[PDB]
Amino acid sequence: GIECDSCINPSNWCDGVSHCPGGEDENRCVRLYGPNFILQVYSSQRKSWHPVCQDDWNENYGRAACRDMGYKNNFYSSQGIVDDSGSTSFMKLNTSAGDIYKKLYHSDACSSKAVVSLRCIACGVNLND
């Protein structure tokens, strides 16, 4: 069971329906992983985070992912890269779906061989390199 704030069933965490009184179970469903900003989404059925495939991903999907992470209209870059996060299961877009985290389905491979790297803001850059 997962807690909202101080308990629900992990199958009702990141499932598309607000079950916690404060919505904590549906507002932290998208995250960036590693120094390469691997886009990951939480699978309720697997109680784990999984990378998003670059298959059929566009800028507008990233801006949706950027909005779900709290970055509002801030969007910087979204490219397809090799998955360095050691994951074995991924999340693939539907394209016939109608929410960003519920617009993906589980997949054990990506047709592009790439996962989404998503940068919502241009940060972390100083005068040197």
Add this chain to the structure above:
Amino acid sequence: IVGGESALPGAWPWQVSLHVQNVHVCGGSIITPEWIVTAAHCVEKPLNNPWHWTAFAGILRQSFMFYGAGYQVEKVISHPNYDSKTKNNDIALMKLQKPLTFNDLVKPVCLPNPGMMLQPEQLCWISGWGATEEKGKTSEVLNAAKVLLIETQRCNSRYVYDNLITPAMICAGFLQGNVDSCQGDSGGPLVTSKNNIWWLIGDTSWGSGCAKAYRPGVYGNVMVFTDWIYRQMRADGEFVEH
């Protein structure tokens, strides 16, 4: 900052000087044009109200933070589980009335992602206008210094902090001292460079003295707070949609 050096323009574009009553009180770190990360103990009552706070960005010198250059703080949010006695969850967020303008002198620092795989003694930097020696006054010029991450096991030792380091805290510095943050650096950034990206891994919280041996700096573990941080900006993003 004790044991460090004066910062150059653009070196730490995320560092902001937070002012109350025309004087620097605490440091902060830009993450978005309107959001600054700081320490909850900086905004304890009576400084919990936003109208007391002004943020200065891109200006290295306190004497150069003139009337008209400051950004008025619109909202202050202390961490819901902050304990003033233990400094646990010493994290606070400040929203600016007008968004910052990003250039080479004002830029955000990247929030830490899970899977950073940082070194147990990762090389880090701390910046701020804090005292350059214990009990000293605010520094006129922005300073910075290299610090090493200290594993909580070692930092929680009996001869260091004796189990005062909670999972919401990380330790950085040198067990011999001479390089450390100090009063006035609180809320400021503890950042590391990885994959040619600077990551805010800590916010300056507390310590026993400044640069004293076996008393390194304790920093709020921003990694633990990112879920809370993301929820706050997202919640504000939807209220303001009104």
